[PDB]
Amino acid sequence: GYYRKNIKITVNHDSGTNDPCDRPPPYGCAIILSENVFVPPRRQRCINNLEKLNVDKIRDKHAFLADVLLTARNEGERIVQNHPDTNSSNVCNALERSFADIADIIRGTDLWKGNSNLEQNLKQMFAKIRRKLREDWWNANRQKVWEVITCGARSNDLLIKRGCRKCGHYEEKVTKLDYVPQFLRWLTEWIEDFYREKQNLIDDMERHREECTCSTCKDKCKKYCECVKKWKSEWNQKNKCNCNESGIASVEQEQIKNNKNWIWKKSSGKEGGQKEYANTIGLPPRTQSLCVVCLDKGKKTQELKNIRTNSELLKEWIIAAFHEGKNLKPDDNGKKLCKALEYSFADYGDLIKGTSIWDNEYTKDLELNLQKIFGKLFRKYIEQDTSYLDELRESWWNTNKKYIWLAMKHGAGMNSTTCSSCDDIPTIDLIPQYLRFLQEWVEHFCKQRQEKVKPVIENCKSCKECKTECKNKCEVYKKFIEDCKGGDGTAGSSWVKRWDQIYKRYSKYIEDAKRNRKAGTKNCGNKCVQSDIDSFFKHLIDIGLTTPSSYLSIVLDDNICGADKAPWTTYTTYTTTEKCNTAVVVNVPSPLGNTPHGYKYACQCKIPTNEETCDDRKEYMNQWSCGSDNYELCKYNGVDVKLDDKDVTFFNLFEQWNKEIQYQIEQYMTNNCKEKCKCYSLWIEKINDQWDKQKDNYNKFQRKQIKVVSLSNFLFFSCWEEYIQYFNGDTFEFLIKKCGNDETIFSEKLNNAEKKCKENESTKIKNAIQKETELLYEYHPKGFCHAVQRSFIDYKNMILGNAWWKGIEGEMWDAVRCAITKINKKDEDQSVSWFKEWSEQFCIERLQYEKNIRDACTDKIQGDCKRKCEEYKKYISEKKQEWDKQKTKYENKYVGNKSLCHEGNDRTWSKKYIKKTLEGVYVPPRRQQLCLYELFPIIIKNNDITNAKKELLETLQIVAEREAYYLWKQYHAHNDTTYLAHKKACCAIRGSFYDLEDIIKGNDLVHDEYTKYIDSKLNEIFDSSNKNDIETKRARTDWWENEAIDPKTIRQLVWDAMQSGVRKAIDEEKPNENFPPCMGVQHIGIAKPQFIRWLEEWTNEFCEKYTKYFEDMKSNCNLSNIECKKACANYTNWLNPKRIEWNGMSNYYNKIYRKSNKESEDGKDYSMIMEPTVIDYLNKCNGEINGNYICCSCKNIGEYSEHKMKCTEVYLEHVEEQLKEIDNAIKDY
């Protein structure tokens, strides 16, 4: 609900900026040593937020619902964190009592609270919506209110629901039915409070009377007796070792019977389970058969509920563990029994300390009895060393985990010296139960997979007809892997779906642990990460194990899942043939693959073809299907076909093919060698066949149309258009050099590709040259190739006044080598080389002048420093004088807190600077025009580490401010000033801030000179006397999101700098604008990966451009050769680069999703994105722009068969007139 609020189904916060819950000591019968408002309980509230409900948003009941749910959520959190009962049933009862209290508040039937001016506030809303209606409203929203109130309840909370888990949060029926009048409810809560106070006083004097002596306790009991009598008098108003002595709190420190089957459903009536963990993790068969009912399989000897001392509790637990040991009695004791005992011991641990995620209709009773026992036993422990109930359970388990382990060992026959019993206690119990269940399930699946794959690997390894050697066994393996029935591992589903559910739950843990800014990891109490799920997953994120794939790769054994090395990291792709229906491509880890790893196109009894190897090498791809009097269409693999229609469709396909093939050839010109150019020559043959087919097709087009320009004319037009669309809107010679003048160009390009393969696969004056080399050596060496090439080319130019020149050049290497041996005894190359030598000389001279001016300079500095500054300025001016001429000559040869920075609306953007593998990454223009000018001075200073950090923080602040100001000014400089422009500028500012964060954290994909110098200097700055890449990349990270420096860390500090910049933008440029709600949220979530943000920005920009262009065409065209052609050319010109960019981005995204830091490329997280394809991810763009959670607002893409004929026919006319312009373009020169 868009309200001072953001977009709130699970937990609110968010309609709370108006009035807080404060007025107020939380209430958790006052003790006496030796008003008539007694009817209301101890808890008087939680109410102030709902109080004075007269905000302008009262015409909609949804605002009232949001406010009441916020109040209920805050009340529930207060009760959960407040009520000191150490009993989940009592906490649930208190939550239900508060729910009934707010029920009577909203219904307003029996409202008796000592607040003023509340009933009128409620009646205002209930008359705007317009007391029976109030009751109907409550009976309608009861379910939602009870869902929101118990959100903060602990996971191991029990509800009696007499009329269960987590205070009845998950019941699909409100649970307790409190329709009773609050008079009896308050009386019941009062008597409960008195009884609880009596037991509290008993617990107090248990450690007081026995130690201090007595009489004072009896006096207090007497006083409470008269207090109770005084209360009841007014009640005419009724008519209206081996124990917990040690106390060890272990801290984690980790570095890099009946029928039983795997149950995955929710907690059923009597078998398996929790509701939250349903259909996302499977109970192992052992975990359901833990022998507490194992007293004698029932109770005949002695009742469980007789634990007077914790010694009895330990005895009972020891007996249970010992009887568990005998259940696994049938070497196995090193790999099977040891692991089984480890998992059973961890299960006991995680069910004693209230971490179990499974239910067996005895776990409820066991948990309730354990809570009662711990409450009645340990009271003094529940000055923060002796005093801690969950921490009490964890400490008790850690103090007595050794005896349970020994008991189960002696019960399994595993007596001693096995898996003096030195360091025998497992560390497995520390990791969360979900990870243990995942590992057990995966190792079971591996056992089955190895059993089913051993015949395959032992049969057709020679091929790494065929009756049953390998055709049949691989069929059995495929049936095992691909079957909707699943198998023993699953519970009625395919392995892929179960793995997807596991991945979803693991990613939910990863995101939940990453969002919690609470200290988590790195809390010294060495590292000493505390015993919590969030801390453990923070540690896993710090390692990089952010996916089940990599985690299982690093925790599982080796050669456990098959004789073929099937890694859990290398994802493999396959097309399903079973129901798992439609042929959907699936990417899964190698053990879950369709066929054994490395046996693709080798199990079908076929030699691996070179074409297949190139097709599965993911390199040198030409995505063109080449399906075919009729036109031999070069149909694309992705989309299929949907003046006549045939020739125009062929023309569009031919134009797209021409553009994409030219781009691919140019890229491969820009871009072990044996198979490399085997695939390269295959690609060359494919594109040559495509070119021949397209030549034939264009001949057919010309002979059938009857005119259209010739083929060469169309290619010349294409060359001109691709030149114009960098030089939008010298050049003459460059165009002559690139393409011809008044079809051969592809012949030359393919010849160039072939010779590039050949080169790659293969790989007096005559004395004056050595004299000059010796002289230059004696001058000093660095960069001698430039000197020798310049001298030789100059001498050649003088002597000449074409293999002969090449022969002379190649013959004189021997002279240079002879000169080298003698001294041991004791882009073109005419102006570009001169430019590079001049640049190197300038760089060296300027670096020397840097220290020359830094000598006596480092407030304003005068004296000697001004002389050096004046000389440096004179040198800079003199060098720039020649730099202008050098740049002009280079371009003529070929073109291919204030601050001094520019503001430039550039709409085109392609890949030019990426670290690179990194294929299909295109940097958005907003990030390309990022202002890092002011960031260079502050780190040129190279002086003190603390001063360097302070100055870097200041410069980051000013850069963020200027970037935000320019972004807001640039977006609103147009005619539009509505809310849409505000949201667009908000999203752009957020993206820029994320890009700054990634540059600081060193995760940016850009690799140009700016970021190169920035991260090169920052690596030196953030070196803590060590050169570890991980250590420095985490030291530059914790300075950002963990350096508090009232505590306003660097992230919110830079965000406030952006806010100040946008306020400066607002406060300068209808009569009075206000601060947008998005900009003032002051809360920023975890940033999505750089590529994903870039992809969303591309989608938003492309959708906006399509909406603008298509609407323009719908008016100009569809009734004309000077106005409709403009829209036609505008729409066609920008589509092809978008086609190429989308193809590259999709190709990249196909190898990103479901990857971790280790198994992916460039070592980025990339784990949170899990959608199958790029379209399936961008589909989850729907909706308008709002704040941060949504940035893309694409809509109305499909619903164009119309405006095709007219757009193409004018395009041909546009080509003819441009080629007629040759009369004044190339004819005269």
Numbering used by the authors: 43 to 45, 47 to 50, 52 to 57, 59 to 68, 70 to 74, 81 to 86, 93 to 103, 105 to 173, ...
Excerpt from the paper describing this PDB structure:
VAR2CSA encoded by a subfamily of var genes from Plasmodium falciparum (P. falciparum) named as var2csa, plays a vital role in the cytoadherence of infected erythrocytes to the placenta. In this study, the VAR2CSA ectodomain from P. falciparum strain 3D7 (~306 kDa, containing six Duffy-binding-like (DBL) domains, N-terminal sequence (NTS), and multiple inter-domains (IDs))8 was recombinantly expressed and purified using the Sf9 insect cell secretory system. The cryo-EM structures of VAR2CSA ectodomain and its complex with CSA were determined at a resolution of 3.6 Å and 3.4 Å, respectively. In line with the previously proposed model, our structures showed that the core region is well-defined and covers NTS, DBL1X, DBL2X, ID2a, ID2b, DBL3X, ID3, and DBL4ε.
However, DBL5ε and DBL6ε formed a flexible wing region. As for the core region, DBL2X and DBL4ε stacked closely with ID2a, ID2b, and ID3, and formed the most stable core center, which served as a base for anchoring DBL3X and DBL1X at the top or bottom sites, respectively. First, the individual structures of four DBL domains (DBL1X, DBL2X, DBL3X, and DBL4ɛ) in the core region are quite similar to each other, with the typical “3 + 2” helix bundle shared. Uniquely, our structural study showed that CSA binding induced significant conformational changes to secure ligand binding, which was not reported by these two works.
